[PDB]
Amino acid sequence: GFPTELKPGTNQFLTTDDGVSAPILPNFHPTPCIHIPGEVRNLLELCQVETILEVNNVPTNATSLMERLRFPVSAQAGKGELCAVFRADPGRSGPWQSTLLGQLCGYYTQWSGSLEVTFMFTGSFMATGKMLIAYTPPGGPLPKDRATAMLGTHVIWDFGLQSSVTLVIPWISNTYTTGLVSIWYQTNYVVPIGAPNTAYIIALAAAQKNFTMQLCKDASDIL
């Protein structure tokens, strides 16, 4: 005796619709949840941890995939040009896919935030030298030389600092779509005798607190 009209879209089964249904076992009491030290509530927590950045995404051989992680600095090249880290776009394919951030960005379509990229020099203790890291905003092309690269956003990195040098890129968006950071030889690799003339440096990258993702999409290769 209670008036009710069935409005359009009744017996539809929408996958994303958040409703409640009858319990298959309405007396079964699940084992009470104890404490387990590590917990995750938001994926951004993972997006904010530093993960190895495969800037050296050149080798492909199965016995040389470990070369991907680190890229070399040597006495060979002087005041030239080291390596151009892929554009500031953790979602797009490339080096950023080695990061946990990158793989997570593959599970979403839109993202916006600031990213931190700390570089870790692993040469000898007696080795010194100066590298010039410089980030150039999107639209504008890759700086042709170091001096021209210096006139923009740049960071002088001396090996008086082992790893503490870390670039903070302002903003990342989705529609040179995204800006690229380049690493330059400001100064030739200089060592004493008995010290190796070639050294490798590891890049580590994460996202800052202000980083977020929005529209979700399941794009995984397997399976």
């Binding site: 949840c33 995404n57 991907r68 946990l100 997570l104 690229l180 397997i222």
Partner: protein, 225 residues
């Protein structure tokens, strides 16, 4: 670029995906008995395995839905019985098995004319959390005389099994296909681990190929982009 609710554990997993399809043909080699047993596999949905293996320990409820039609998508006047068989109780072997009658195995009686059956399965594990990765062996005994294929096996994550059949003493008149959708509800994840790198080779172990690959190697050289 403001709300962070999009990246929560809940909104990341909570979504009803096609998790398995039951086939009850009129005549064939697949199911000549007009019934089938489907053990609850979260890895029925493709992308879900690589998803949940981001963490080691997890806990969740699951909402199941049963979209049933003929292989043409035609709905027919047929009565169906979806039976849930808990981890303990044994699965039915014959169509006239006494497992279909046992009360402690909850059953759902729907029609194809009725909207897809929907039920909710609570956290079944006897442990405090599910566990996709077990570095060891289930038994707590000195038994080490057999072929230890029990490595990686963790029979505590058993969520039970559904049992689909056409109600009645006589075989069904229509060819049917029952599709099963699972949706994770209240979810908690614990220990984070790196996301799968290589293709999955097997179901109960993280084995990989004899030839390792890589995420991507677009750059032909380090210098040039």
């Amino acid at each position: 670029s403001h709300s962070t609710a999009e990246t929560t554990l809940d909104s990341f997993f909570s979504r009803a995906g096609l998790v398995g399809e039951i086939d009850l043909p009129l005549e064939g080699t697949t199911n000549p008995n007009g019934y089938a047993n489907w053990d609850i596999d979260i890895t029925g949905y493709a992308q879900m395995r690589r998803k949940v293996e981001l963490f080691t320990y997890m806990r969740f409820d699951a909402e199941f839905t049963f979209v049933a039609c003929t292989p043409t998508g035609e709905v027919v006047p047929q009565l169906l019985q979806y039976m849930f068989v808990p981890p303990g109780a044994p699965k039915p072997d014959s169509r006239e098995s006494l497992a279909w009658q046992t009360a402690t195995n909850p059953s759902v009686f729907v029609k194809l004319s009725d909207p897809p059956a929907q039920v909710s399965v609570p956290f079944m594990s006897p442990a405090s959390a599910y566990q996709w990765f077990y570095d060891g062996y289930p038994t707590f005994g000195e038994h080490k005389q057999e072929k230890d294929l029990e490595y990686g096996a963790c029979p505590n994550n058993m969520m039970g099994t559904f049992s689909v059949r056409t109600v009645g003493t006589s075989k069904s008149k229509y060819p049917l296909v029952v599709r099963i959708y699972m949706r994770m509800k209240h979810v908690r994840a614990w220990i984070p681990r790196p996301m799968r790198n290589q293709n999955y080779l097997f179901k109960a172990n993280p084995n990989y190929a004899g030839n390792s690959i890589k995420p991507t190697g677009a750059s032909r050289t380090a210098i040039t982009t």
